[PDB]
Design a protein around this ligand. Structure first.
Ligand SMILES: CCCCCC/C=C\C=C/CCCCCCCC(=O)O[C@H](COC(=O)CCCCCCCCCCCCCCC)COP(=O)(O)O[C@@H]1[C@H](OC(=O)CCCCCCCCCCCCCCC)[C@H](O)[C@@H](O)[C@H](O)[C@H]1O[C@H]1O[C@H](CO)[C@@H](O[C@H]2O[C@H](CO)[C@@H](O)[C@H](O)[C@@H]2OP(=O)(O)OCCN)[C@H](O)[C@H]1N
Ligand SMILES: CCCCCCCCCCCCCCCCCC(=O)OC[C@H](COP(=O)([O-])OCC(O)COP(=O)([O-])OC[C@@H](COC(=O)CCCCCCCCCCCCCCCCC)OC(=O)CCCCCCCCCCCCCCCCC)OC(=O)CCCCCCCCCCCCCCCCC
Ligand SMILES: C[C@@H]1CC[C@@]2(OC1)O[C@H]1[C@@H](O)[C@H]3[C@@H]4CC[C@H]5C[C@@H](O[C@@H]6O[C@H](CO)[C@H](O[C@@H]7O[C@H](CO)[C@@H](O)[C@H](O[C@@H]8OC[C@@H](O)[C@H](O)[C@H]8O)[C@H]7O[C@@H]7O[C@H](CO)[C@H](O)[C@H](O[C@@H]8O[C@H](CO)[C@@H](O)[C@H](O)[C@H]8O)[C@H]7O)[C@H](O)[C@H]6O)[C@H](O)C[C@]5(C)[C@H]4CC[C@]3(C)[C@H]1[C@@H]2C
Ligand SMILES: CCCCCCCCCCCCCCCCCC(=O)O[C@H](COC(=O)CCCCCCCCCCCCCCC)COP(=O)(O)OCC[N+](C)(C)C
Ligand SMILES: CCCCCCCCCCCCCCCCCC(=O)O[C@H](COC(=O)CCCCCCCCCCCCCCC)COP(=O)(O)OCC[N+](C)(C)C
Ligand SMILES: CCCCCCCC/C=C\CCCCCCCC(=O)OC[C@H](COP(=O)(O)OCCN)OC(=O)CCCCCCC/C=C\CCCCCCCC
Ligand SMILES: CCCCCCCCCCCCCCCCCC(=O)O[C@H](COC(=O)CCCCCCCCCCCCCCC)COP(=O)(O)OCCN
Ligand SMILES: CC(C)CCC[C@@H](C)[C@H]1CC[C@H]2[C@@H]3CC=C4C[C@@H](OC(=O)CCC(=O)O)CC[C@]4(C)[C@H]3CC[C@]12C
Ligand SMILES: CC(C)CCC[C@@H](C)[C@H]1CC[C@H]2[C@@H]3CC=C4C[C@@H](OC(=O)CCC(=O)O)CC[C@]4(C)[C@H]3CC[C@]12C
Ligand SMILES: CC(C)CCC[C@@H](C)[C@H]1CC[C@H]2[C@@H]3CC=C4C[C@@H](OC(=O)CCC(=O)O)CC[C@]4(C)[C@H]3CC[C@]12C
Ligand SMILES: CC(C)CCC[C@@H](C)[C@H]1CC[C@H]2[C@@H]3CC=C4C[C@@H](O)CC[C@]4(C)[C@H]3CC[C@]12C
Ligand SMILES: [Ca+2]
Lengths: 138, 583, 104, 40, 8, 100, 419
């Protein structure tokens, strides 16, 4: 199941069910591209980076020994956190570590020089065209 | 208008003296950079490290010694890196240990290091920050060769790890790395760490990582005592680290009163008299030549590729009476790493493009760029003059032949090294160099001119001047030293090529400033600055060695000097040679 | 026995009589931020998901429609004594008896 | 916790996408209607 | 200023 | 009580705020009538040689963070705008009681 | 005959050689060569999303029209052949159009001679059959061997198809068919929004070919204009309604035309919008986006007042303006109007400051990749270097176009009044 992101609205979501072969290692990979944000959308320390949240892994892991049914009012509290469906497996939920990623940044010091320079270029074009279209050779 | 039809005439009337004036101006500007107005003093500029203080408490000298003695004996017995001993010892001090295997095939046998097909293993151990997650990491590495050196560096590394393991205040992970061959192991480890196949080296996949690397330090030490510490900063393709790292090292050198040096030269406390400028010029020239070469002068140079600030430290014992023990070096490293812990962001606020007349003096880009701007002005003036006279085909063959010769120079030498060996009695390694020389010489004898006016050679010269100016400026942006050196050797002779006049003189001047003569002159200058002179035959041998090293380093590390010269700069000089001998 | 990610996480199952889940989710996060002295008001639509096969109920359940489930994680939240003071305030003996005397 | 078969069957199987036939008919009818003006 | 100096 | 600093080398401002909080609590003002805003965390910063402590003098005989402490505004919710909202009462409708 | 075939063979050989080298992947990712509206990777991403059951327009990565989806759905395997075919097609169309235009020009210039409306001493300004012989072959060569076009082809950018559609519009217009002209203009407006400005020049050329006078008190003029406009608008309506039925949604419309008009993505390019709107005060953003997108449509009317009798030069100027002032520009858009320079090189004697402008454009072209590298991989530079280079490039383009316009007017004055 895949849900695509929308800028400033919602994140990506990816959910997969994979069968892992015995005595092996499996790799999952996907490519991404970094974005340039507006100068007002960065944190007070913008050269630190952003965090990707840890990922979740859930599985039913095989057991060395078979377990008997248990009553929750007579068992230790650390044995009654997850309901047990079968006596030959047990449920686990693992979390990975977070990741730190950097983005390209703009210049936070000059929001006002940019306006002047770009408007100057547009004005150059306007002046050339007006002078050429309005006047006449003498 | 007549305003700008009155300036052009003046430029045409005074073109000859203006070029001389601007060339002299550029040379004088480069010679003025070691004097106080352009040269500043270094300062910290980062408050994360400037506003804090560190109290060292390291005390493990005997342990470092014993570790070194046990490491040396085991390596003697094994004949190579003792891996089981390192793993067991690393586990005994309390790290997470890992290994990696690597191998590659070299383009041709190497005489300097005596390797053809190389295989080895790297051992690294990780210290995890107790009160954080694995998001950032610092690296401390010791590169080992096959020359039975750096045992004391390994001992100091292990003692420092044993001291660091018992603290709570680490905000980043620390990696302790020992590599198999000097710079091939480091390259293999970095490529496996970032999961990129930049060079083609093979390896086993890594099982342990520690986050994003922020900074790294490499240590070389082959004696129990030291008389001084030496630092290296230049990396591959002329890239530099942030100046704050060097300021930090220098800040931990005065606290422990240790003799620090840059380029192997000691600097005065202050410019007491006119004796200072000579030493400043010597240091600046050595830095310029090293940055022009583009070689990784240590393990730290390969780290500059991944935007990681890297520093190399070498200890010297040189018969001076005053000696420093290992505890002082350990304390200095402890202070440096403790102050690197206090950073809250990436290093991003000092200088990334700079020159160093001394360990505590610097020049920034906006002060030294005019030296190359002035010579580009000469090229522009000559091109403007050519355009004027041209306004007051026959080009296809020169252009195509020149580029074809450049491509032949780039591609042929490594291939066709077995055919030459079979047909003629030469060893493999020197065959590549001889093919390079043969193609270089064959470029000069113009083949199409065997077959049997003003506008043709004027247009050719205009095109060549524009092309050279483009390349010069682009090269300067990548590496200032390389561009400045090439400009100061090639501008005046390219500005004087004319088919009519003293052609013998012009040919003699064109031959002596080709990209191949520049290298010989630079080698002689490098030997003269080191205070170790050279003779003719020794210089020729060193020249051949340099050519072989250049090709091999382009193949193994990704250095760009060989492709730049052979593919871009040789054909332009050929075009000027075509201009001189038009038909 | 039990594991958690770095920072703060929160997942909630709502009752089927709830009409608007997003409004109630926002109000609940704002209310919890006052009790536990954490910055849970930074939970918004850009860091909230609706899992389709994960995070099933841990108690007595009749039907499992994931329309009524929300989940969020803030990976840079800090846990210090300011978080432990409200936590110990909700215990009945309140750090003055039993095993609670060991929490320093 | 983690019912595998139900999770597998909670989604319809993935079939490859194909352009609808009406769109094809419309395209080619339009093109030939244009062709019959300039040629006949 | 660049736009309205030429026009009106 | 408001601290408007950042990073780890600005330890002093946080220490001052903590001292004021300790005094006012010792003299009787309840924790529900104190609005404490701290811009950065120095007690459980990973650089701290002594976790969960903030000291005023180098003898290390008085910890001003204390065993009992509650902070209303964390590192990223301290801003000029929020301080002005708290003072003027023009706060977003869903804000809880403890933070006004 | 043989020269055109030889030129085509050389161009195809160069493209095929560059497709097989180790630089194709490097070329395919340049920010100067691809855009959020042209990248090939976004094409394959949309096709994959369709096979996962998700609408391609439900995300933020895919901004292509449904017709591109249809075409590449049927020809994903033969991708590298399609672009070679399209480049050859646009070159051939330009060749034949220029041939016909030269015939008209010489015939029109010859007719004036006997009406003796030219000054007595104006010769060496007269066109001669020996100089117009190789203009079309040159035009084809300038398009095909431009490095910008080769770079666009190897990257498989969609801009090539747009250029082909524009070239076919020109060919059908000069050959005198209004129905095909309206169809091709509609197909060009469907892909990108700005080509609607080329409506006026083509109408003027068609009216001039019919010998219909252009006056406010004329009857044939209004009837012809009404018929042409109706055909164009109907073409657009039918294409849009047909596009609805591919996926049974109207979602492509905000994804394409809203994206073009509103400029939400701030990826760097060679244009003038990205850094301006990454450094903007939020109070004035709406006003500035409105101004900077009116600027493109601004010049059509006064240019049509001045250049009423010269529709093709008018077309050339309009295409250059579109290339300079669009929201997401690429070098493939730049190559199209540079292909027209040989047509206007008889104006060389009245050109001023051509040398410096050419040198500046050439320098900026090489300075784009080096500064991109120093900013993004070395970390030794910042975005101000790149912004300065973009500013210089656009200024040089504007100056060059103004120079050509001045030279045209000066030659007209000398023709009428005497040298
Ligand atoms: C030919 C006709 C041309 C037509 C128009 C001209 C257009 C381009 C040509 C020339 C440039 C003009 C426009 C350039 C403006 C922007 C570019 C610039 O100047 O930046 C510098 C780029 O370098 C170059 O320009 C040249 C390099 C190569 C390009 C070649 C040029 C074109 C060549 C093409 C053709 C050549 C040959 C062809 C012929 C054949 C980079 O320098 P830097 O970043 O260090 O400096 C900036 C900045 O400097 C300026 O921009 C100058 C100001 C005016 C410039 C405009 C020029 C006027 C007229 C030009 C005439 C041209 C001809 C026209 C007539 C036809 C500026 O001063 C500072 O404001 C800026 O910030 C500074 O950056 C740095 O400064 C701060 C301090 O370090 C720092 O701020 C942070 O740190 C402070 C702490 O002290 C804090 O207080 C701040 O808040 C701040 O935040 P912080 O906390 O640090 O957070 C950090 C998180 N990252 C900045 O960080 C720092 N970056
Ligand atoms: C559907 C696609 C849409 C695409 C978007 C583009 C749409 C905009 C259309 C483009 C308009 C460009 C021109 C606008 C300015 C025209 C005004 C003007 O210059 O009038 C002078 C005008 C000329 O008068 P004159 O007596 O001929 O002078 C002769 C001189 O010797 C003087 O000698 P001269 O040689 O200098 O003669 C000047 C003039 C002589 O020519 C003219 O006088 C013609 C002026 C054209 C006026 C444009 C129409 C008005 C505004 C557009 C809206 C039309 C209705 C559509 C709206 C929806 C209605 C249901 O010739 C020109 O230079 C004019 C160039 C314009 C030609 C192309 C425009 C075609 C418009 C498209 C037609 C579409 C179908 C319309 C509906 C048909 C059924 C009703 O002088 C005045 O007195 C000014 C008028 C006030
Ligand atoms: C001929 C052809 C044509 C083309 C060409 O040649 C060929 O022409 C050439 C020529 O044309 C060149 C230009 C010439 C003019 C040049 C100007 C130059 O700027 C000036 O450069 C000076 C260099 O000494 C000063 O900048 C200092 O540079 C040091 C590094 O070299 C910094 O180390 C220091 O900042 C430090 O900051 C921390 C503290 O330790 C200190 O403050 C200070 O050591 C800077 O100085 C600071 O620079 C800041 C930014 O400008 C402020 O100005 C600040 O001001 C202080 O502010 C305090 C607060 O009020 C006040 O109390 C105090 O008095 C002030 O001093 C000032 O300290 C000065 O400053 C700054 O302007 C710019 O870099 C490059 C420049 C454009 C050149 C670029 C390249 C060219 C085009 C060449 C080009 C190839
Ligand atoms: C033929 C002549 C060639 C010359 C080329 C034309 C150059 C003209 C413009 C030069 C100056 C630009 C405007 C100044 C704004 C910068 C403001 C500033 O402070 O920029 C400074 C000047 O730096 C530059 O950008 C240097 C100028 C580089 C210009 C490029 C010249 C190379 C040639 C390229 C062309 C190739 C081919 C050409 C030949 C045909 C940077 O200041 P410093 O770094 O010390 O200190 C600030 C750093 N800090 C502390 C903030 C981190
Ligand atoms: C570097 C490639 C060698 C080219 C061979 C000679 C022909 C070109 C000469 C003309 C001008 C050369 C530009 C100056 C070199 C810049 C040095 C540099 O920063 O070179 C590189 C960055 O340089 C650039 O990215 C600038 C692109 C210039 C292309 C111009 C071709 C026409 C530095 O890193 P890399 O070498 O890993 O970059 C990989 C780029 N590569 C090899 C895949 C093309
Ligand atoms: C050539 C012009 C541009 C490049 C400028 C060159 C820089 C200056 C040259 C010497 C300064 C170097 C100082 C620091 C570097 C290391 C110093 C050093 O150890 O020796 C210099 C060191 C030689 O080391 P060895 O001889 O192996 O070691 C002997 C014992 N040490 O020099 C180098 O390796 C420099 C790199 C060589 C340059 C080659 C680059 C291109 C190679 C092919 C050329 C292309 C075709 C053109 C010529 C072909 C026909 C001849
Ligand atoms: C890798 C990307 C970068 C490479 C560049 C790719 C495209 C960029 C160039 C775009 C072209 C811009 C303008 C070119 C010509 C426009 C005007 C024109 O064609 O004028 C001609 C003249 O224009 C010029 O050629 C003047 C420009 C100055 C000369 C150019 C010299 C520099 C050549 C390149 C040297 C360095 C190459 C390095 C490789 C990058 C007139 O010729 P004519 O019709 O024969 O007139 C004579 C009448 N009997
Ligand atoms: C680099 C450009 C300027 C082209 C030519 C310069 C260099 C490439 C080379 C070419 C000839 C070389 C010179 C040839 C001979 C000598 C004599 C040599 O003198 C000796 O020590 C030899 C014994 C003696 O004469 O006493 C010192 C180096 C020097 C100046 C060499 C220095 C480097 C030079 C100038
Ligand atoms: C393009 C790059 C390589 C710039 C280098 C400029 C060249 C002109 C350099 C390269 C080698 C240099 C030579 C290296 C060694 C010497 C010997 C030196 O003689 C001494 O040993 C000085 C002591 C004395 O006898 O007083 C005089 C300068 C000279 C010829 C140098 C002159 C300048 C040279 C030719
Ligand atoms: C011949 C037709 C095209 C009319 C003449 C052109 C201009 C008068 C109009 C036509 C389309 C208009 C654009 C259509 C859509 C938008 C998006 C719109 O974006 C938003 O409102 C979103 C928020 C923001 O970014 O401010 C800003 C104005 C703008 C660029 C409009 C500016 C004015 C334009 C260029
Ligand atoms: C889908 C792509 C290939 C386009 C194919 C050609 C399109 C543009 C054709 C197919 C049918 C055509 C239309 C058929 C009939 C009319 C009515 C006439 O009074 C004006 C033109 C107009 C409105 C045509 C415009 C062009 C048109 C829409
Ligand atoms: Ca409170």
């Amino acid at each position: 199941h895949y849900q695509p992101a929308q800028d400033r609205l919602q994140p990506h979501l990816l959910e997969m069910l994979i069968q892992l072969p015995a005595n092996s290692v499996t790799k999952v990979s996907i490519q991404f591209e970094r974005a340039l944000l507006k100068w007002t959308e960065y944190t007070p320390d913008p050269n630190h980076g952003f965090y990707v949240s840890p990922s979740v892994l859930s599985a039913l892991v095989p057991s060395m020994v078979a377990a008997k049914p248990v009553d929750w009012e007579e068992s230790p509290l650390f044995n009654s956190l997850f309901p047990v469906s079968d006596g030959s497996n047990y449920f686990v939920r693992l979390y990975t570590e977070p990741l730190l990623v950097n983005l390209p940044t703009p210049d936070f010091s000059m929001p006002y020089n940019v306006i002047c320079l770009t408007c100057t270029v547009v004005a150059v074009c306007y002046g050339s065209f007006y002078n050429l279209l309005t006047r006449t050779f003498h | 208008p007549v305003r700008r039809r009155a300036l052009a005439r003046l430029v045409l009337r005074l073109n000859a003296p203006l070029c001389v004036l601007s060339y002299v101006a550029g040379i004088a500007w480069f010679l003025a950079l070691v004097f106080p107005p352009l040269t500043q003093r270094t300062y910290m500029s980062e408050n994360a490290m400037g506003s804090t203080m560190v109290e060292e408490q390291f005390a493990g000298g005997d342990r470092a010694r014993a570790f070194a003695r046990d490491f040396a004996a085991h390596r003697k017995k094994s004949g190579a890196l003792p891996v089981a001993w390192l793993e067991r010892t690393m586990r005994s001090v309390g790290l997470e240990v890992y290994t990696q295997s690597f191998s590659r095939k070299l383009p041709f046998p190497d005489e300097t290091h005596e390797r053809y097909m190389v295989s080895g293993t790297n051992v690294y151990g990780i210290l995890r920050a107790p009160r954080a997650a694995s998001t950032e990491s610092l690296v401390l590495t010791v590169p080992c060769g096959s020359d039975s050196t750096n045992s004391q560096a390994v001992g100091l590394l292990l003692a420092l790890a044993a001291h660091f393991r018992g603290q709570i205040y680490w905000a980043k992970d620390i990696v302790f790395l020992v590599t198999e061959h000097d710079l091939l192991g480091t390259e293999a480890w970095l490529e496996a760490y970032h999961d990129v196949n930049v060079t083609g080296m093979q390896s086993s996949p890594l099982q342990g990582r520690a986050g994003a690397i922020q900074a790294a330090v490499a240590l070389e030490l082959s004696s129990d005592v030291v008389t001084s510490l030496d630092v290296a900063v230049e990396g591959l393709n002329g890239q530099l680290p942030n100046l704050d790292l060097l300021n930090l090292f220098q800040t931990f050198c005065q606290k422990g009163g240790l003799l620090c040096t840059l380029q192997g030269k000691l600097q005065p406390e202050d410019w007491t008299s006119l004796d200072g400028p000579l030493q400043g010029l010597q240091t600046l020239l050595l830095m310029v030549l090293r940055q022009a070469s583009g070689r990784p002068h240590g393990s730290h140079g390969l780290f500059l590729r991944y935007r990681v600030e890297a520093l190399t430290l070498r200890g010297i014992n040189s018969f001076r009476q005053y000696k420093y023990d290992l505890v002082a070096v350990g304390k200095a490293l402890e202070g440096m790493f403790r102050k690197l812990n206090h950073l809250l962001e990436r290093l991003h606020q000092s200088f990334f493009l700079y020159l160093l007349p001394g360990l505590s003096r610097f020049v920034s880009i906006g002060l030294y760029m005019p030296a190359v701007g002035f010579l580009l002005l000469v090229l522009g003036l000559k091109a403007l003059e050519l355009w004027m006279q041209l306004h007051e085909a026959s080009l296809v063959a020169p252009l195509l032949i020149s580029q074809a010769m450049g491509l032949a120079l780039y591609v042929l030498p490594v291939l066709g090294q077995h055919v030459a060996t079979q047909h003629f009695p030469v060893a493999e390694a020197e065959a590549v160099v001889l093919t390079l020389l043969a193609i270089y010489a064959a470029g000069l004898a113009l083949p199409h001119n065997t077959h049997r006016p003003d506008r043709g050679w004027m247009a050719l010269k205009l095109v060549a001047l524009i092309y050279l100016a483009l390349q010069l400026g682009c090269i300067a942006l990548t590496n200032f030293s390389l561009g400045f050196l090439l400009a100061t050797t090639m501008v005046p002779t390219a500005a004087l090529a004319k088919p009519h006049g003293p052609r013998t003189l012009y040919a003699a001047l064109l031959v002596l400033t080709s990209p191949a003569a520049t290298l010989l002159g630079s080698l002689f200058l490098w030997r003269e600055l080191q205070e170790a002179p050279l003779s003719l035959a020794e210089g020729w041998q060193l020249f051949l060695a340099a050519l072989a090293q250049g090709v091999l380093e382009h193949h193994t590390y990704g250095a760009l000097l060989f492709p730049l010269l052979s593919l871009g700069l040789y054909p332009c000089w050929l075009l000027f040679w075509n201009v001189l001998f038009w038909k | 026995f039990l594991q958690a990610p770095s920072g703060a996480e929160l997942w909630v199952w709502f009752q089927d009589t709830v009409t608007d889940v997003d409004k109630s989710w926002k109000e609940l996060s704002n209310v919890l931020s006052g009790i536990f002295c954490a910055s849970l008001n930074f939970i918004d639509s850009t860091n909230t998901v609706t899992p389709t096969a994960s995070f099933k109920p841990l108690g007595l359940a009749n039907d499992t429609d994931h329309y009524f489930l929300r989940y969020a994680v803030l990976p840079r939240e800090v846990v210090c004594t300011e978080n432990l003071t409200p936590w110990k305030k909700l215990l009945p003996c309140s750090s003055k008896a039993g095993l609670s005397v060991l929490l320093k | 916790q983690l019912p595998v078969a139900q999770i597998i069957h909670q989604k319809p199987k993935l079939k490859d996408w194909h352009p609808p036939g009406g769109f094809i008919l419309g395209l080619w009818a339009l093109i030939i209607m244009v062709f019959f003006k300039t040629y006949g | 200023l660049p736009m309205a100096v030429p026009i009106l | 009580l408001v601290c408007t600093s950042r990073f780890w080398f600005n330890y002093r401002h946080v220490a001052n705020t903590l001292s004021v909080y300790r005094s006012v609590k010792r003299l009787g003002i309840p924790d529900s009538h104190i609005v404490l805003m701290l811009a950065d965390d120095m007690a459980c910063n990973p650089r701290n040689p002594k976790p969960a402590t903030v000291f005023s003098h180098k003898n290390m005989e008085l910890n001003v963070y204390g065993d009992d402490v509650e902070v209303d505004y964390r590192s990223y919710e301290v801003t000029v705008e929020n301080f002005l909202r708290v003072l003027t009462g023009r706060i977003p409708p869903s804000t809880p009681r403890s933070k006004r | 005959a043989a020269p055109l075939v030889l030129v085509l063979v050389v161009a195809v050989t160069v493209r095929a050689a560059l497709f097989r080298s180790s630089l194709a992947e490097f070329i395919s990712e340049r920010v100067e060569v691809v855009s959020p509206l042209s990248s090939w990777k976004r094409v394959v991403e949309g096709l994959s999303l369709l096979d996962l059951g998700v609408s391609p327009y439900s995300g933020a990565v895919f901004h292509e029209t449904p017709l591109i989806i249809y075409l590449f759905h049927f020809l994903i395997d033969y991708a590298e052949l399609v672009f070679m075919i399209t480049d050859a097609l646009t070159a051939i169309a330009l060749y034949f159009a220029i041939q016909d235009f030269n015939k008209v020009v010489f015939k029109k210039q010859k007719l004036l001679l006997e009406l003796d409306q030219y000054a007595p001493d104006v010769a060496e300004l007269i066109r001669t059959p020996m100089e117009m012989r190789y203009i079309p072959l040159k035009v084809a060569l300038f398009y095909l061997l431009n490095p910008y076009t080769i770079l666009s082809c190897v990257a498989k950018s969609t801009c090539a198809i747009n250029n082909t559609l524009i070239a076919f519009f020109i060919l059908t217009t000069i050959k005198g068919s209004a129905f095909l002209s309206a169809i091709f203009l509609a197909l060009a407006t469907y892909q990108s929004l700005y080509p609607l400005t080329l409506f006026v020049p083509g109408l003027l050329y068609l009216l001039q070919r019919q010998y219909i006078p252009v006056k406010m008190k004329s009857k044939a003029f209004w009837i012809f204009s009404w018929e042409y406009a109706m055909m164009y608008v109907g073409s657009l309506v039918v294409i849009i309604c047909l596009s609805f039925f591919l996926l049974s949604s109207w979602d492509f419309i905000p994804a394409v035309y809203g994206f073009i008009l509103s400029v939400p993505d701030l990826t760097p390019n060679i244009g003038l919008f990205w850094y301006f709107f990454a450094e903007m005060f939020e109070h004035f953003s709406l006003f500035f986006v409105c101004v900077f997108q009116i600027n493109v449509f601004f010049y059509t009317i006064p240019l049509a007042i001045k250049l009423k009798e010269h529709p093709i030069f008018f077309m050339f100027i309009q295409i250059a303006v579109i290339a300079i002032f669009k929201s997401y520009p690429t070098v493939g858009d730049v190559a199209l109007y540079m292909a027209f320079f040989p047509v206007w090189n008889h104006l060389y004697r009245f050109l001023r400051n051509i040398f410096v402008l050419t040198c500046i454009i050439i320098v900026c072209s090489l300075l784009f990749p080096v500064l991109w590298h120093l900013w993004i991989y070395a970390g030794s530079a910042n975005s101000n270097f790149f912004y300065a280079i973009t500013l210089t490039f656009n200024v040089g383009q504007i100056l060059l176009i103004s120079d050509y316009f001045y030279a045209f007017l000066r030659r007209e004055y000398y023709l009428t009044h005497g040298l």
